[PDB]
Amino acid sequence: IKPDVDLTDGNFYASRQAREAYRWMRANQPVFRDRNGLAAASTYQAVIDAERQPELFSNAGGIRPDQDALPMMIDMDDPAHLLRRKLVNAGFTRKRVKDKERSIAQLCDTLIDAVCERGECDFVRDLAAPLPMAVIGDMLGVLPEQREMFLRWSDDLVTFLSSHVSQEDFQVTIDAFAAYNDFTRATIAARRAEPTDDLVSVLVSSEVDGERLSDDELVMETLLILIGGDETTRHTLSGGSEQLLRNRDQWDLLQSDRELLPGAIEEMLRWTAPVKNMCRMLTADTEFHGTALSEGEKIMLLFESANFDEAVFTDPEKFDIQRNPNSHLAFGFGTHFCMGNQLARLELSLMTARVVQRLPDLRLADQDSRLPLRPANFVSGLESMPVVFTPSRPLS
Ligand code: HEM
Questions:
Q1: Measuring from atom 3 of ligand 1, which residue has the nearest CA?
Q2: Does residue 312's CB lie within 6 angstroms of at least one atom of ligand 1?
Q3: Ligand 1 atom at minimum distance from 348 CA
Q4: DSSP assignment, residue 358?
């Protein structure tokens, strides 16, 4: 009954055997070691305990299992992490995010306008994937005419930061970083010359304790915002909508009562957990929930496993938009708790509301399909999602 798994193999997260493996871990070895000896916290309690002990469970070795740390806030410990976060968080105040509703809602209606006359689309390719990229592109000063070029960068940049870059990909990947770097430094220079109220303008002016973000830091932190908030948000939108359609009583409940939308978004986040893991590196030997851990090794925090922990969530394989409490760990916990969580929730809220209203009879093309998942060991979710609906006229 024990799973024979490599937690650094993206195929594990795409196999649809992962939650069965998680169940074995939570029941039998809550701090699990995989077939290569990699440690992983599988229970909600173990994930929370590690998050609450950043001096023992550090981010400064990097958040990926077999990669060096990068000079960005997520690979830093406090108090230096706080300064970097304080500087960047000026772009993500509650007002600034709330003020994005008008533009985000307009993006949602434009995306739905593009497919509403067809009566079919791919929910991932045509709705869930374009929205987070357009939202982040808008904040970074990407013209809609530059969205094609910017979109190729964003896909190739995921490969750049991934665990293995093939010989055949090395060129396009370093070319994507260079292109992103050059583009971003141009935007930075433009806002230092002529400030506006976009994200880069806010970041170039941000000052904490007489310290500002350097140009190097601005490229790194905007890159973290782009990669961190693009595919993740996409996967919650698609996988959450998949669950509304597979449990159509939940779709009907939400369609009938807009006040259920916040709870629905939280259940979509709990269920989809697009960030499958973040690593911590041990700063000392320790005994952790029955497993001996050694100084210098990394442990994965399995957020999806935690989100299906029966110790915290009653009937966790039931998708329930009215679930309360719903203290899921899709955004993590503690000092690195997702900086983009309010923006992600707003994108998800606005798009889901518009889909339920404008594609009211949305359905999966084939409910017996096992839809394909991205075989990546870090962020994963649906690769495609064919849907059908009654055509309607665009709002234009
Ligand atoms: C549904 C979408 C999202 C998910 C599931 C998600 C998930 C996460 C997770 C799990 C972490 C690490 C927390 C931890 O280790 O405890 C994180 C950190 C972060 N996320 Fe997100 N995220 C999402 C959307 C976004 C967006 C839209 C942004 C854009 C600003 C963003 C920017 C960040 C940043 C900058 C960090 C690093 C925070 C820090 O180190 O202090 N994320 N996110």
A1: 232
A2: no
A3: 1
A4: H
From CA 112, how far away is CA 346, in angstroms rounded? 17
The residue type found at 151 is: L
Across the beta sheet with 39-41, what order do the strands follow? 31-33, 39-41, 298-302, 277-282, 57-58
Q: Which of 338, 349, 380 to mutate to test the pocket of ligand 1 (most atoms within 8 A of CB)?
A: 338
Question: What three-state secondary structure class fits 217?
Answer: helix
For the CA of 274, the nearest atom of ligand 1: 5
| Distance separating alpha carbons of residues 65 and 300, to the nearest angstrom | 8
Solved how?
X-ray
As a dihedral over the C-alpha atoms of residue 93, residue 157, residue 332, residue 50, rounded to 10 degrees, the angle is -130
Cis bond before residue 79 (omega within 30° of 0): yes
What are 59's strand-pairing partners?
none
Greatest alpha-carbon pair distance for the chain in Å reads: 63
Based on C-alpha coordinates, what's the Rg of the chain? 21
Q: How many CB atoms lie within 10 A of CB 28?
A: 11
CB 65 within 8 A of CB 300: yes
290's torsion region: left (phi>0), alpha (psi -120 to 50) or beta?
Answer: left
Task: Specify whether the CB–CB gap between 185 and 219 falls below 8 A.
Answer: yes
DSSP string, 80-147: HHHHHHHHHHGGG-HHHHHTTHHHHHHHHHHHHHHHTTTSEEEHIIIIITHHHHHHHHHHTT--GGGH
274 lines ligand 1 (CB under 6 A): yes
